[PDB]
Enzyme design. Structure first.
Site, PDB file in Angstrom:
ATOM      1  CG  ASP A 134      -1.864  -1.257   1.162  1.00 39.22           C
ATOM      2  OD1 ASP A 134      -1.389  -2.361   0.815  1.00 39.22           O
ATOM      3  OD2 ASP A 134      -3.078  -1.165   1.328  1.00 39.22           O
TER       4      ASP A 134
ATOM      5  CE  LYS B 179       2.579  -1.649  -4.120  1.00 41.58           C
ATOM      6  NZ  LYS B 179       2.413  -3.108  -3.303  1.00 41.58           N
TER       7      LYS B 179
ATOM      8  N   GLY C  42      -4.351  -3.893  -5.257  1.00 45.76           N
ATOM      9  CA  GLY C  42      -5.098  -2.793  -5.439  1.00 45.76           C
ATOM     10  C   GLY C  42      -4.619  -1.378  -6.034  1.00 45.76           C
ATOM     11  CG  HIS C  43      -0.624  -1.793  -7.752  1.00 42.15           C
ATOM     12  ND1 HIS C  43       0.300  -1.998  -8.481  1.00 42.15           N
ATOM     13  CD2 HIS C  43      -0.574  -2.182  -6.591  1.00 42.15           C
ATOM     14  CE1 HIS C  43       1.203  -2.772  -8.010  1.00 42.15           C
ATOM     15  NE2 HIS C  43       0.628  -2.971  -6.577  1.00 42.15           N
TER      16      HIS C  43
ATOM     17  CD  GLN D 289       0.825  -8.690  -2.691  1.00 41.78           C
ATOM     18  OE1 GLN D 289       1.286  -9.521  -3.418  1.00 41.78           O
ATOM     19  NE2 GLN D 289      -0.228  -8.081  -2.805  1.00 41.78           N
TER      20      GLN D 289
HETATM   21  O1  LIG Z   1      -1.369  -5.983  -1.484  1.00 40.55           O
HETATM   22  C1  LIG Z   1      -1.767  -6.222  -0.453  1.00 40.55           C
HETATM   23  N1  LIG Z   1      -2.077  -5.219   0.562  1.00 40.55           N
HETATM   24  C2  LIG Z   1      -2.112  -5.586   1.981  1.00 40.55           C
HETATM   25  N2  LIG Z   1      -2.022  -6.848   2.587  1.00 40.55           N
HETATM   26  C3  LIG Z   1      -1.692  -7.449   1.643  1.00 40.55           C
HETATM   27  C4  LIG Z   1      -1.687  -7.530   0.109  1.00 40.55           C
HETATM   28  N3  LIG Z   1      -1.400  -8.702  -0.619  1.00 40.55           N
HETATM   29  C5  LIG Z   1      -1.454  -9.586   0.581  1.00 40.55           C
HETATM   30  N4  LIG Z   1      -1.532  -9.072   1.875  1.00 40.55           N
HETATM   31  C6  LIG Z   1      -1.405  -9.319   3.098  1.00 40.55           C
HETATM   32  O2  LIG Z   1      -0.258 -10.661   2.969  1.00 40.55           O
HETATM   33  C7  LIG Z   1      -1.053 -11.745   3.720  1.00 40.55           C
HETATM   34  C8  LIG Z   1      -1.136 -13.070   3.162  1.00 40.55           C
HETATM   35  O3  LIG Z   1      -2.146 -12.955   2.308  1.00 40.55           O
HETATM   36  P1  LIG Z   1      -2.250 -13.715   0.810  1.00 40.55           P
HETATM   37  O4  LIG Z   1      -1.406 -13.013  -0.181  1.00 40.55           O
HETATM   38  O5  LIG Z   1      -3.795 -13.714   0.432  1.00 40.55           O
HETATM   39  O6  LIG Z   1      -1.842 -15.269   0.514  1.00 40.55           O
HETATM   40  C9  LIG Z   1      -2.231 -11.263   4.327  1.00 40.55           C
HETATM   41  O7  LIG Z   1      -1.950 -10.646   5.710  1.00 40.55           O
HETATM   42  C10 LIG Z   1      -2.519  -9.955   3.636  1.00 40.55           C
HETATM   43  O8  LIG Z   1      -2.767  -8.919   4.428  1.00 40.55           O
END
Ligand SMILES: O=c1[nH]cnc2c1ncn2[C@@H]1O[C@H](COP(=O)(O)O)[C@@H](O)[C@H]1O
Ligand SMILES: O=c1[nH]cnc2c1ncn2[C@@H]1O[C@H](COP(=O)(O)O)[C@@H](O)[C@H]1O
Lengths: 431, 431
Positions: B13, B16, B40-41, B224
């Site tokens: 967040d 990007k 969610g860019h 991420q």
């Molecule tokens: O783009 C992102 N923004 C915020 N949290 C993310 C993002 N991608 C993954 N997460 C975090 O990464 C962790 C693992 O989730 P996963 O990527 O659905 O497998 C979770 O805590 C999500 O908060």
């Protein structure tokens, strides 16, 4: 380059081990960035063999600190076993070896699962090393895989192991109808080694960062070859780890930008172990001959390796992927006695297309055919030569051609398993 | 640099999306190297929002060819859904978008499993996006995961899907005591999209190789942030993919050496969504205030994000790992109105140690404490300023300090969501 990399182009068995050792005579560090105990990097110093699986090929050197990055799968049993064997031979392993807080752990069930799964597939059997590699990498990404750092608190550890094990056991006994892998023994076996292990632990990310700013020669050592890459290989008849030069920064912790030279080891012919597409394969005399002439059996499982001619179409994928800088030509001597050596310049697709680019997945290799370029052989022996002028023009030409067909310079030639049966025309560490 | 990279330092967040767009005004390509539909860019051109999950933020540009590398998890449903929405808005997606033969596929069961697993953990709930990411990455490494290329033969495809599904179902109904996820529907749903999908397929490895030799500006776009990295993050409360700059060469196919500049996006404060260690967290006014002042809710799941001050100790891990070259400072305006802004210079370990280096695994953060360096705030508004001289000395100082505390130059400042509310002091693509 301060930061020199050394990895395999073909399907492994190029000869990474000998090369790392021989090259590390100025190395502060030496890093394994990926793999498990499935590799078998062999060294032969002054006549004495050494077969390193999980232990970095820099172990046989005082000055060099051998490390194993976060990108490695570590079997406790495996490590200790290699430790003993190296110790009884006079190598102060515990002193030289370093290792990641983040390396996921390979316990017995990881072998159990690997074992079970390979069975279910029946006919479409990949050809895994039986070293539980896949399942550990799995659990790792699953986010249930136990890692070295978890050992830093035996209390909670056995709690996690309890769950992890139960889960993996439910499917062992209910799905695959196998035998439950006993928790307690796992624990006993794992606890009798923790302190020794957890003692060599380190923050290898910051280590590499530091070394870099100082200017320490560092050499990364790859396990397997590019065409077996989890992402870019002949899937799924590949390994569960990014054997590509991108594995360095992901497996060690070092930033991608600080790589100064990728040295691709290139075996003068081709070999493949485990099922999968091998375009240039041979089943004739030359096939068995190459198997014999170069002692071609899997240095871990003993599996007789398949032979074929150096596939230049395949090499070129490696060349682009790993951003080679030069080539280390190994096994030239195996070609001695041949009346003619031919390499593969392009593929004839199953639809008629001629192409110098490769198919991704395993299926996409279904009818591909080798288009050679036969060059004369040589009855002269190139075994142990250490000067270019000891190579006959024929063999000399075979080198000139491969530089052209790839645009990559073969900076190192190797006339034997022994560290001194090598010719160096360009040193990675200083150019 | 021709090959410029743009990824996140914090826990995602950072912003990007806006940055890739704004920067791509000269980009031939734009690549997603990892992640799934969990990002969610957000973009805001001249006042109009756009929320890109799986679709590269270069989509809103004619000249730029947006690609998605082998390192991406692709949910068919997901893609098509984003396609429609972008199409109805006038964006010729099918024409601009490119995609990997190797990208493993995210079907519904991958959501089913993800769902089930997150439940079993009860209390120790990570906080996954519910987008089946983890399981696809899993099956991928397991070597049973279906990939885009498998679609190139509907015959055999449903055969594999049959097995894969049965297996994943045995544990859904027997282990987790859940509901079987129906095969047929999976197939129907997947077949009604194949041709559209398989039409944009390409050999992205060779693409990048080509572009490079020509000199095409290329920009990689990360999903991420670093601290969530599968390997180097606060495990296991992280994402199943190498969100580090090493993911580029592994996820796209391009050689590590050809990276010319890694741009780390740095949000002027900290935020975290999903469970896990967040040293500098706030639960006071400033905590909620930062949540409010910057509209802090997960742009995919809507989850209210946690706030804290810019943790400089954390940033420095990123700095070394991703080999930054500069910093993109986003969200400065959120700090407007504060009487004082403080950043974290070091950690006080639970044993008394003061340190400027970070703990790996999640457990190792168990008692760490923030050691700040309070600087004055500012009542002046920095919202939308596009010149340095529009920033008061106080805020100006906050920048000067962060350059020092990191040694990395903040080459870009951002005063709003809109592409034009940016200040560029150093362009990645030309230095
Ligand atoms: O783009 C992102 N923004 C915020 N949290 C993310 C993002 N991608 C993954 N997460 C975090 O990464 C962790 C693992 O989730 P996963 O990527 O659905 O497998 C979770 O805590 C999500 O908060
Ligand atoms: O170092 C190696 N030499 C030869 N084959 C290997 C090596 N490492 C892995 N393999 C092959 O990679 C495949 C997958 O096995 P895995 O690495 O045990 O999971 C098998 O075909 C093994 O042949």
């Amino acid at each position: 380059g301060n930061n020199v990399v050394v990895l395999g182009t073909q399907w492994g068995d190029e000869g990474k081990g000998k090369i790392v050792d021989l090259l590390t005579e100025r190395a502060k560090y030496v890093v394994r960035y990926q793999g498990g105990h499935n590799a078998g990097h062999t060294l032969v110093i002054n006549g004495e063999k050494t077969v390193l699986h999980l232990i970095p090929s820099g172990i046989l050197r005082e000055n060099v600190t051998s490390i194993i990055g976060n990108g490695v799968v570590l079997s406790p049993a495996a490590l200790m076993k290699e430790m003993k064997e190296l110790e009884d031979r006079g190598i102060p392993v515990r002193e030289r070896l370093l290792l990641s807080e983040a390396c996921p752990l390979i316990l017995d069930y990881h072998v159990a699962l690997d074992n079970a799964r390979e069975k279910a597939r029946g006919a479409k059997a990949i050809g895994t090393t039986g070293r539980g590699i896949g399942p550990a990498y799995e659990d790792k990404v699953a986010r249930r895989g136990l890692r070295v750092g978890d050992l830093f608190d035996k209390e909670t550890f056995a709690e996690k192991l309890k769950e992890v094990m139960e889960y993996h056991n439910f499917q062992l006994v209910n799905y695959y109808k196998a035998e439950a892998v006993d928790y307690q023994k796992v624990l006993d076996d794992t606890m009798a080694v923790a302190d020794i292990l957890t003692s060599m632990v380190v923050d290898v990310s910051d280590l590499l960062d530091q070394a870099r700013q100082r200017g320490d020669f560092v050499m990364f050592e790859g396990a397997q070859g590019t065409l077996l890459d989890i992402d870019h290989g002949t899937y799924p008849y590949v390994t569960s780890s990014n054997t590509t030069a991108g594995g360095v920064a992901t497996g060690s912790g070092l930033g991608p930008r600080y790589v100064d030279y990728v040295l691709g080891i290139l075996k003068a012919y081709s070999t493949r172990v485990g099922a999968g597409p091998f375009p240039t394969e041979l089943f004739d005399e030359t096939g068995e001959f190459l198997c014999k002439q170069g002692n071609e059996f899997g240095a871990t499982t003993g599996r007789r390796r398949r032979t074929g001619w150096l596939d230049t179409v395949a090499v070129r994928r490696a060349v682009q992927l790993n951003s080679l800088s030069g080539f280390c030509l190994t096994k030239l001597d195996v070609l001695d006695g041949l009346k003619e050596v031919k390499l593969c310049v392009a593929y004839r697709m199953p639809d008629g297309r001629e192409v110098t680019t490769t198919p991704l997945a395993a299926d996409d290799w279904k009818g591909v055919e080798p288009i050679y370029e036969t060059m004369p052989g040589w009855s002269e022996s190139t075994f142990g030569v250490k000067d270019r002028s000891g190579l006959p023009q024929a063999a000399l030409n075979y080198i000139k051609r491969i530089e052209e067909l790839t645009g990559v310079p073969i900076d190192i030639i190797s006339t034997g398993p022994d560290r001194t049966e090598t010719m160096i025309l360009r040193d990675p560490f200083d150019a």
